[PDB]
Amino acid sequence: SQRVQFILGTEEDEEHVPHELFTELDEICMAEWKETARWLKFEEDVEDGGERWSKPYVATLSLHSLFELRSCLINGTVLLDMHANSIEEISDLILDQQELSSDLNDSMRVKVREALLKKHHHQNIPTGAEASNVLVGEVDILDRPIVAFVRLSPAVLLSGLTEVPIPTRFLFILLGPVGKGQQYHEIGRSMATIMTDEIFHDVAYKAKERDDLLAGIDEFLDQVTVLP
Amino acid sequence: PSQRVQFILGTEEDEEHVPHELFTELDEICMKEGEDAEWKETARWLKFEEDVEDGGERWSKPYVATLSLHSLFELRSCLINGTVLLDMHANSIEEISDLILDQQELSSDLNDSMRVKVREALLKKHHHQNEKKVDLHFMKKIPTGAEASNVLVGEVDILDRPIVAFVRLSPAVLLSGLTEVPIPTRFLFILLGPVGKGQQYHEIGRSMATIMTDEIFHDVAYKAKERDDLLAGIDEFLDQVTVLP
């Protein structure tokens, strides 16, 4: 699994070049999207009712939530080098998966697309940076969670989506039923935090298929130290 | 769940199976052909960890242990595939080793020559840090009813597979010359394998010792009735650790 790993990091690729990442975590509960955290090697969280950004700190993760993230990449939608130039397009491509629309009602799809297209309220530094939008939260009508990892082919400035006008390269979407909100917050944190890992973040840029990503996670998990 | 099994354990009626606080010592060996070799204490725990450093000259300042995730999975793997002998009634280190080596499974993997070397290794003296009654100011720091846990890892030239054993004694026993401090031994962990696995084993040893400082896991260790209770223990622990990227 470091076998699978090394083959990826050293593939010939043009435009698939890695950039530095700004990562924003927004959350929803069905109501609008609310920015709750952001990354840039260090993490800051929204607090005191939205009044304030915390001081920057070095993120730590619950192993539990990393496993959940891993499970998400095994069972979820993974769309790489998606050529979409807007959020409508992205959401429809996800929802129109011949498998992912076979888990949802007609009624369930309506609510979810409506959610992905809700406005993003924000709290309101590298040159060639791209953005990664981690969008997680609850939707009342769901009975299953909905997971998607997307990598756009040209990065695209998705209007009003990121707190800073930066082109999006990655999106992670985790939507699920009520009572899963805190779990999703940490899964979201884990996706964001793991993208700050230098080696894993390269894998995400160069991955050609779902298993490549799992090799990335597994290699990460194999190298970290834990605090009892 | 894996806290299903867990919650069931934490609350079973058991007498003398009562949990105690733990002193844990990590000793390491290396058996290279022709070269004589004994056990050397390399670390100890009492909630905090201290390591032997600078070539055996010195103890470290006490610190809060951290573990490699890798070595914890290996440890889990050790408990899945290794010898698990709970409530062993043995009153000496000879007796304990024979019981381990006489598992109808664990002796169907070994040469006659391989059993000989390994028994010889287990019976080597244990060098402790105290230049060597003659003990410490450390002994004062030890809770009154505490029992000890001995983590023994290392290399044996003649092995080609690793050898793992987790043992819990039924009465705890003051195994002569084994612990650096006269405390009855309750737990033993043994990991012996071929040369070149030495540093890997050191971290599995640290993981074993450290996981015994865990309040919940150490309760499971005292009350486990079977190998599966231990793994639920390990899995619960893993589910709750925090990771430092």
Residue numbers in the entry:
A (entry chain B): 43 to 72, 78 to 171, 241 to 344
B (entry chain A): 42 to 173, 232 to 344
What did the authors write?
In the brain, NDCBE is primarily associated with the presynaptic vesicles of glutamatergic and GABAergic neurons. In the plasma membrane, most SLC4 transporters are believed to form functional dimers. Furthermore, NDCBE activity depends on a Na+ gradient.
Each monomeric ntcNDCBE forms an α-β sandwich fold by nine α-helices and ten β-strands. The main dimer interface is generated through a domain-swapped antiparallel β-sheet, including β-strands 5 and 10. The domain-swapped β-sheet is stabilized by backbone hydrogen-bonding interactions between residues Thr341 and Leu343 from β10 in each monomer, as well as backbone hydrogen bonds by Leu108 (β5) with Val342 (β10) and Leu110 (β5) with Val340 (loop between α9 and β10) on the adjacent sides. By superimposing the central β-sheet (β1-3, β6-9) of the individual monomers of cdb3 (chain P) and ntcNDCBE (chain A), a pivotal movement of ~23° is observed between each monomer, while the central dimerization domain-swapped β-sheet (β5, β10) remains intact. The experiments were severely hampered by the crystal conditions, as we were only able to form crystals at pH 4.4.
